[PDB]
Amino acid sequence: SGFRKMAFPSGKVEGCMVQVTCGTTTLNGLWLDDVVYCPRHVICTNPNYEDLLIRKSNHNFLVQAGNVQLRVIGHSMQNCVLKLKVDTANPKTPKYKFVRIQPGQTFSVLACYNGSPSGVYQCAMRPNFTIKGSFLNGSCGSVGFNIDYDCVSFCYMHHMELPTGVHAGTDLAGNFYGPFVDRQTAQAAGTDTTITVNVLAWLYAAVINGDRWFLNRFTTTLNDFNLVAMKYNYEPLTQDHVDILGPLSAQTGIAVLDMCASLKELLQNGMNGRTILGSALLEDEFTPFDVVRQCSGVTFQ
Amino acid sequence: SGFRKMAFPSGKVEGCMVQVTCGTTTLNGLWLDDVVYCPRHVICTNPNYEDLLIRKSNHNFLVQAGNVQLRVIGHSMQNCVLKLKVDTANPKTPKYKFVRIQPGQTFSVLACYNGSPSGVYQCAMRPNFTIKGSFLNGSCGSVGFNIDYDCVSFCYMHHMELPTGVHAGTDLAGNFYGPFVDRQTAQAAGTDTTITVNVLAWLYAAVINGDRWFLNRFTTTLNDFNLVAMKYNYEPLTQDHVDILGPLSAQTGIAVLDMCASLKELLQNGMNGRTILGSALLEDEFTPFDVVRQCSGVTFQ
Ligand SMILES: *[C@H](O)[C@H](C[C@@H]1CCNC1=O)NC(=O)[C@H](CC(C)C)NC(=O)[C@@H](NC(=O)c1cc2ccccc2[nH]1)C(C)C
Ligand SMILES: *[C@H](O)[C@H](C[C@@H]1CCNC1=O)NC(=O)[C@H](CC(C)C)NC(=O)[C@@H](NC(=O)c1cc2ccccc2[nH]1)C(C)C
């Protein structure tokens, strides 16, 4: 019992982090087989990255694998990430893949500086394609990831902080999530909605653990609920989301539309000095798979 | 910028998790050097552990480390912790200590099932010596820990769950935090109070990240603050604590008794639909060390 914000174990990723130095810039790299991945703006000092990358030589890239300096023997750019081929393959390379996640999904973040892990925490890909992270100067190149039995599905690499304090980044194939670019120019994050299907996973998790004050005996239709979601800046609820909330419904015996009626009252009336799972706000960075993982103890060998 | 409930890298601790089976109990063990630490109620089926234990043989203790079956060559009991001596030293053993934490201190918990890391999160030793975890059946043996440069400071092992859904356990020398015992009797947690110095630290961390709606130009005396603390179920504040919150005060240029006055008026008036650091509650699970280290980017080799 209990419900915490849980991060994946970070050991499989720690073994990959290295330090990338080029000029005045030191950031974090990700070393998988013989390739080291980093943010391309490590080669900056509104740039011209292509221009900037042909002026570099292999010997300008200093790669620390801890107490071991790595030798670069090639480079190339793939969108906003720098692929640095080095003469050694990482003995700690896990089974991995590169996936690009959808907004509303979550992932874990190993924050790194100078190549050494600082901490790990759990994030969601907001609907405005930002993430609310903890990143300081030097964290760039840190990555986000999920674990699938033995497989690290890397889904984020870190690049920048926006003026509101939220963060922006790219998949491991270099493509930014959302309309963000790797430049100190100004850009707005965009209006963040609330991930409705996740709030509803989180309530199912509350029922599973014995917070039940918010439940009622009213029911609603998807249309009459979604009417209310778009007044509170919640995200529209689809039948596909209703199908995903299935097993959670079946476990608790609370129909999805029934739980939708509880989110309506909570939305219109507030919470009234009570808490759900320790929070006094509706939590939306728990997908339905996250709730089931945690509320059933799925592990990752 | 940003502030998250951050956990320590759990890599050095994952290499230490193992299954420990005995009868039809299965739980996790911590394997440092050639001793495997686990909870003594693995030998359970109000017991007399003396009698239960004098009464197993080494071959009762199934100790699995992945696809490797460690032979137990001896055993012994230190309070509520079983020490399973085995023939193989763990090549992945890091520098470690066993330390006992004080109420208010924080740590990371690598939840585990069948010796397999499931996920990692951060916690506090409540002032009633409970913790608020996410533990399912089979999680016992999971450990709480801190990191200190390169050294793992194990401080907690899980044993049980109290009826209100909170968790209890021991240091690694076997001794329970708080007045709990490893029996299926009834114990109530006892009145929990809010870790005041931590709330103040969380407030500093809010200032350091720009959340500014709750501060004022009032001050108070450590006495008249603690007077109001006693009324809101808040731990008293010491000069020791004031000394401790110094560097945060020095960084923000807000005297500690000034932040006490801000807390005082958050407590008597509440937050009024506003949020601090994405929460509608005064969060008390960050130490001054937690805040400093995250708002500074301390890493770990
Ligand atoms: C790399 O480690 C670092 C990570 C930043 C630094 C501190 N916290 C972080 O998240 N990356 C950078 O410093 C970015 C540089 C690349 C070339 C983008 N920039 C930043 O994060 C800085 N701000 C911006 O660049 C910035 C301003 C702005 C306005 C509109 C839209 C986007 C946008 N980005 C921070 C440090 C101010
Ligand atoms: C070990 O994996 C397991 C972990 C529990 C199971 C569910 N959540 C957990 O953290 N430990 C146990 O099952 C404990 C057995 C030892 C011998 C204590 N017991 C429990 O945590 C159970 N609760 C109690 O038995 C219980 C309630 C209570 C109240 C007052 C005093 C003592 C006391 N024990 C769980 C299954 C409810």
Q: Which of B280, B275, B286 is nearest to B205 (CA)?
A: B286
Residues 6+ apart with CB under 8 A from B113: A297, A299, B28, B136, B138, B139
Type of residue numbered B225? F
User: Residue B34 contacts by C-beta under 8 Å, 6 or more apart in sequence?
Assistant: B85, B86, B87, B88, B89, B90
Compute CA distances A76 → A36, A37, A38, A81, B75, whole Å: 11, 10, 11, 9, 56
Tell me the C-alpha distance between A266 and B206, whole Å.
Answer: 27
Expressed in angstroms and rounded, the spacing between residue B181 Cα and the centre of ligand 1 is: 51
- CA dihedral (A293, A294, A295, A296) in degrees, to 10, reads 50
Of A6, A15, A275, the CB nearest to B120: A6
Identify how the structure was determined: X-ray
Q: φ and ψ at A69, to 5 degrees?
A: -85, 130
> Which amino acid is located at B193 in the chain?
T
- N- to C-terminal Cα distance for chain B? 23
Which of A140, A155, A260, A295 is an active site residue?
A140
Interface touch A121/B296, C-beta < 8 Å: no
Angle between helices B256-269 and B196-208 (to 10 degrees): 100
Inter-residue contact B199 to B282 (CB < 8 Å): yes
Q: Is the CB of B137 under 6 A from ligand 2?
A: yes
- Give the Cα separation of A132 and A169 in Å (integer): 11
Q: Which residues of A touch B278 (CB under 8 A)?
A: 132, 281
Helices (H), A148-255: 196-209, 222-229, 239-244, 246-252
Whether domain B196-295 has CATH 3.20.20.70: the reply is no
Task: Check: CB of residue B284 under 8 Å from CB of residue B198.
Answer: yes
Q: Which amino acid is at B291?
A: V
First to last CA, chain A: 22
Instruction: Kindly give, in sequence order, each residue whose CB lies less than 8 Å from that of residue A103, ignoring residues fewer than 6 positions away.
Output: A125, A126, A127, A128, A129, A177, A195
| Torsions phi, psi for B158 (to 5 deg) | -80, 135
Active site residue B140: yes
The β-bridge partners of A144 are: A109, A156
- Taking the CA atoms of A248, A250, A253 and A255 in sequence, report the sign of the dihedral they define: positive
A148 touches chain B (CB under 8 A): no
B159 phi, psi to nearest 5 deg: -125, -35
Residue of B nearest to A284 (CA): B278
Q: Which amino acid is at B59?
A: H
- Strand B96-98 versus strand B151-161 pairing type: parallel
> Using CA atoms, how far apart are residues A186 and A184, in angstroms rounded to an integer?
7
Resolution for this PDB entry, in angstroms? 2.5
For domain B12-86, the CATH architecture is Beta Barrel (2.40)
Nearest CA in chain A to B135: A1
C-alpha to C-alpha distance for B4 and B11, rounded to whole angstroms = 20
- The secondary structure element, H or E, covering residue B25 is strand B25-32
Task: Name residue A168's beta-bridge partners.
Answer: A160
| SS3 (DSSP) at A34 | coil
Q: Does A169 touch chain B (CB under 8 A)?
A: no
Question: Cα separation of B293 and B127, whole Å?
Answer: 23
CB neighbour list of residue A130: distance below 8 Å, 6 or more residues apart: A162, A166, A167, A168, A178, A189, A190, A192
C-alpha A43 chain-centroid distance: 25
Q: Which two tokens stand for residue A238?
A: 């689809």
Closest ligand to A134 CA? Answer: 1
Distances (CA, A) of B92 to A125, B34, B65: 34, 11, 12
Catalytic residue among B38, B112, B140, B260: B140
Contact A119 B279 (CB under 8 A): no
> Tokens 């208010």 label which residue?
B104
- Let me know: does B75 contact B56? Beta carbons within 8 Å: yes
* A112: nearest Cα among B292, B277, B286, B301: B301
Residue B167's DSSP bridge partners are B131, B161
Q: Which of B1, B3, B14, B148 to mutate to test the interface with A (most CBs of A within 10 A)?
A: B1
Closest CA to B141 of B161, B112, B117, B166: B112
Q: Residues with Cβ < 8 Å from A293, sequence gap 6 or more? A: A6, B118, B119
Ligand at shortest distance from the CA of A165: 1
Look-up of token digits 């943010």: A39
Residue A140 annotated in active site: yes
Q: Are B114 and A300 in contact (CB under 8 A)?
A: no
> What values do phi and psi take at A255, rounded to 5?
-60, 150
Contact with chain A for residue B21, Cβ under 8 A? no
CB neighbours of residue A89 within 10 Å: 12
The CA-based diameter of chain B, rounded to the nearest angstrom, is 68
